[PDB]
Subunit: 170 residues, 12 copies
């Protein structure tokens, strides 16, 4: 395993988590009205769990001998996802499209890390897998709200519960 | 009191509870989209409480000298309600119609048992009454969602709380 | 309703509960060996719940204008059940026979009170019913251990939980 | 069962509970001095439980197809008890007389509802019974403080515990 | 500071809180259907917190040497807000208009008290401020639901949490 | 150490605890009126802790090879204290005299056991000491209420807390 | 990975879990007598955890685009294990044979799913693995009771704890 | 703001809190008899909260660059209140007079600090205000017990709860 | 009050909180060795509380009609503090200098907002004050570690406790 | 008191506790079958409490200026009990004989230490006594299971509760 | 036993505890810098437990018929230890010397009381012993920090836990 | 997979865990002085988690048909790590070298087991992985303390939390 290549993937993943924390704050605040009320708590669940993903990734980056970029702006520029900007027409439907697109990219990011580490870096693989569980659930929440695809998921107990990644959290 | 007749009523009631647990799982998974989100947690509350009703009925059936049928398929065939099948056109409105119909039949089932045991089998009456409380509440939830009849009910604290039947639960 | 007659029934019921608390202590201590270990916790559950039944009955006796006898020996003499003496040959089998006989008498006592108060003294009826729930469960525990009659009961959560009478307990 | 007649009884009962919440606030504040300190917590227990009784009655009124009056002043005028006014000479003794009189009327109100619904409306009967338990206890508290009639009651665990009606509370 | 003038403001504020508790009960019960489900829990949060505001105001009124009116009808007549009557056409939209209007008046009431007590009665100011926090949040909830104005608020943890006024509550 | 003599002391102590549980129930119920309210919770604390003392003593009696008497009436006759009968004139003052006398005898009983076992039976000594702590506190509560002797004791946290003997309780 | 083939395996696994919930209820009720008491709590632990396995499998089936069968009888017919029927001679020994056989088949089912998904569907693999942990423990419990094979397992904390699959449970 | 002058006020306030902790211990121990029992818990509430006030003041004194006096006797001499000595005739009435006088002086002390810091030292003002809340409540408790002035206050939940100053406590 | 000017201050304050969350993560990771261990938990306390400050500020910004910047890089550029960069020579001493400088700037920021809103915007003032409490404590922690100035502060209970701002947090 | 002699006793006691932790693990794993199930939880209770005894003894050994042996094999050789080897014929009966013999030796060990320290080293005596309580209970559990001697003991609440020695545990 | 002599010892012990509470506050505030951070929490643990020791001693002093001195300055003058003054050169090393000296004197004080009461006043002996446990632990903490003597002690769970004396605390 | 070879690896791993529990006890006791205080809690965290690793490994060894060695000395001789002896010069620096060396060997041990079981024994692999998580964290703690390598780890919540292996613990 090329640790420099792995470190680059993890730092880019961490940057996506960190910026998602910011951009979902804005998206949550614009989920207004009666139909917005249907999704506000779901955005908040995802936002807090993505903050937890950042918290879980940083110790592994340092364990592997990497470091966060010195400047926060360089960090944000590294995000492996496009910024989840508020849509120009911020209807509930357009907000859900942004959320679903962001979550699908996240699922891709951790699938890539899992594929790269499978049978080589077991701790990193297990961390990538734990986050992948939560991203697949996030994607399911938003795909159900937007397209009506059936799913067997509920809201979390508490927001930010992170049932899969909590074993990595302090 | 004819204990064989009473045992038949209780086993048929238990079969309705057990199959409801299965069929509400399907109905919950199809409560999708923005308007589905309004009812998903309510279906889940009812589903878990109906599972509790099955758990509460089985000890009384054995106390009275009855037994569950040997085969699960014979048990399901005994249910005193029609199966709450997913509608052919599974809109939220059609799903609510199935739920309301199932809950109205349940209210009828336990009203029948209460009438049969009133002043004769106090333990069985009190158990039937406890379940009846929860079925009347279930019926109220779905009638409010579907027809707009005013009601003073909320969601449970936790799903499956069963405030009335919990004294019968282990 | 003849309140003096009702008071006599309740005081005799309370005396049976109180003495059961003493006699089950002895029976529990003699449930020894490997097969005794199977029943020790079940005796302890019943003993603590019967202590709770005494605690629940005393406020109702005073509400109705009755009182406990001045001397504890007169109280014990009033018990509506025979004393659950340790058997002369205190095998596990003989101990279970004593327990089952005591619980069957208790079920009879509260059935009598429920029949007397049904549709006349609702508070007393509901208290008698709550205790009756627990006595029917106690009888079921011991009949299952002794005769092998199937039952759907477990051990309590905690000993002395009294799920049915706790609403009457301080 | 005449549902209109039953609805009238329940709404009048609810009005008595609601106004009691207000009037007991005043009575509690005037239970001053060293002897007032003996009863302040008891008034507060009763006040909070009577607020719970209002909360428990409203869902049943709507379940039965009734509604609260449009104006709060019309609601207060419906109370099935006389207003528990602060006495002109607000000594502790006179305050206890007001409390005892109010609680005796409450016991009468729910006894009437239980008698009307016994064996006809099991859910309403069980709700009336649950409240009746707490009113009989309230009456016992104040009769003991005022007349010295022995009783086996304590203060609640927490104020407003409502051990009997909590299964009806959200 | 004119304590009589301040007492009048606080009693009128308390009357508005108390009647809001009644009128929001009715409004909550009429938030029916799928779109009603979006707001029912929000009305219930506000209703329970406004009940807490009444509870917080009464001790301060008595500390300052005031008292509640002898009759509940005189109390209700003092409310510094118009009664939040159910609209003649009780659609969700019309119900939200009533709620928003009531909350805007409440914000005005406590702003007036804060302005009157600022730098003069620190305890009263801090109490008025604590309630003002919760009224501004209530207004934000309903303005977001009705007009779509963005906001960063969620549902409470538990209904009636009152995070700002709880330090004044017993 | 003469184990037969020690067993006799412990069984007589256990009998005093058990009968105290009964007699304090009566005394608590007669602590009525405004001045009775001052002592009711204190009697209840002592009553529940004396029940705990019985529970703590029985395992040690069996560990030492003793046993409870076969009949409850023989057990009661063994009590090392006089029965705490309700006074012929059951004023609060006379009730306190009975309580204080009973607690002073209890302090004597466990002082005797501690003296007999000191430096000989460490487990029994430590159990006697633990109960002695609670009896000295019980005596202090009642001597303060009756004679006005200053003391630094409060009510327990919860009734029956038994802070000293709980390590011996199951 | 052939998702249709995987969906078939998961639905058959879910059907086995669901029917096990029913059949273990019967088996638990027939674990009577003194030797039955040794296994009743162990059956109940397994029964509740197998109910949890059904709950964990359903969301994954829907995530993968599958669905539960429309009719409960078709679902039961799909179970990848033979029905755990009560034996014709329902001795404790024969009941244990049924339990052990059912658990060994379950271990086989999830081993098959793990083998099929290893390095291909990480979320499904991890879910299959979590259930496999609990089935291997279930098999160990019953093999120890029946054959005396040493094992280092205890009862769960609470029944239905599901320590391995709880991260998948709502 | 003259920080030396402010430091002098805060140290004198801290000294009053610290000595109150000692002197209320004595006063609590002399609140004996039946009427003493009415006030013992109230003294204990005030005593523990005044200990909390000392704990809250010390960090602010050090933040502002002050320090506690080197010797405890010099500290005690600085107290901004007269020592709450046990009265020469320590009746309950005379003890209440001492308590009320001490609490009125405390209210004055923190009113002075609030006036001095208003709009100048916001952290110190908020701390002074938090303590002032609790002193006004303490004064209300004792004025109600002594003079019979109506008040809307209860006992704390737990003694030493300090609902207003707890945010300053570690 | 100029709401546009106030909104600018609050958004700049929020940006400082958000970037502090990032930069303190880096600083915490470089507090290594035996002397680093002394400060790691203190940095983590401050970091989590500053994250809470961001969470508390965002709802107020939206209440006042402001919004977060569309892009995260524009947000970071608005921070009213200089970025707390890791020092070129990252000794513990140099890290503490960065922390102290950042906290002193934060104290200045909220002092400015409090001065601007005092007696004009009570909700905003109270929020600014709550954050100011925590910043003054943060400054005290680091000044004590670096310069040895005495202070009366401890570590928090849990990291991120935010005792002063929690009433603003969801 | 000869501290070197005392240190030798305590280190030998600690070695017996430590090795018991290992050997009871093996014995627990061989308590198989239906009759093994009766004792498995009892062995586990004793094993965890003996681990606690080791934890409690080590601080006292260091307080007294002693130390653990450098090598674990020398430590094990010091154990004041014979190793509790699995019997050559590991029936439940033979396993109980090993357990009872080990516990009787433990009771002897702490009786010796108590006798040596009585009235000389109060801290050490109290620690020896606390452990002695638990060893006498352990001996009672196994003597009851093996010989049928009556006893008044139950299982612990949780395994490893150590009610007597917990005050010495961190 | 000479109770006057014993009372003098206990009052002097209580005075030492009370003044230690004050003087350790100062010492804690001067444990600054990186090496001060190592001991601040340990001083705080000892300070809060010594406050608990004062609370535990006062009830026993009153039980024995003693009383606290009328004036706090006379109380402080009675302390059986020298005042733990801040050193003229308040380095961490010099502060530890003061702490160790104070704790060694405390160990001496309670050793004296234990020796005086051994086999004469069991309640007082047990209280002295409980405090002695905690003083020996306090001495161990500071001797380890100062001289490097090995010890097996940790920080408490929570500060002021007082595991040995809590049974004496309200 | 060669189960005999796997059993040998697991037993050797278990022996290393068990002896680490002993040797870290000694190392913790010698982490004295001001710089020792920095690491004492970290050693204790690792020690308790390594005890948990032993507890987690034993059930798997028995599941696979292995057994612990009959004698504890043979078990200790099997440890796959060298004994973590106290250094001849037990400075903090030398103690950290021993700890780091022991943890690096542990990381190697579980890496070997994971490599051997990957894709062959999923339950054993997952157990080895869970322990590997905790060993990598242990190694990180000590490498940071000794060499100053940056890391993102904290102390555990509670000592012995074992967040990764707890799902395997009873
Ligand atoms: Fe919706
Ligand atoms: Fe058994
Ligand atoms: Fe009183
Ligand atoms: Fe009183
Ligand atoms: Fe009183
Ligand atoms: Fe350090
Ligand atoms: Fe068994
Ligand atoms: Fe340090």
């Amino acid at each position: 395993i090329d640790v420099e290549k792995l470190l680059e993937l993890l730092i880019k993943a961490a940057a996506a988590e960190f910026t998602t924390y910011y951009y979902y704050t804005i998206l949550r605040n614009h989920a207004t009205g009666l139909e917005g009320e249907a999704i506000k708590e779901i955005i908040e669940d995802a936002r807090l769990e993505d903050r937890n993903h950042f918290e879980a990734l940083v110790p592994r980056i340092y364990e592997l001998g990497g470091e966060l970029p010195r400047d926060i702006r360089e960090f944000a520029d590294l995000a492996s996802c496009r910024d989840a900007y508020l849509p120009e027409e911020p209807t509930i439907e357009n907000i859900l499209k942004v959320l679903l697109e962001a979550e699908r990219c996240a699922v891709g990011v951790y699938t890539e890390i899992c594929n790269y580490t499978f049978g080589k870096d077991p701790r990193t693989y297990d961390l990538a897998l734990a986050i992948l569980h939560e991203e697949i659930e996030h994607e399911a929440w938003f795909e159900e709200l937007l397209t009506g695809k059936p799913s067997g998921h509920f809201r979390r107990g508490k927001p930010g519960e992170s049932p899969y990644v909590s074993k990595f959290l302090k």
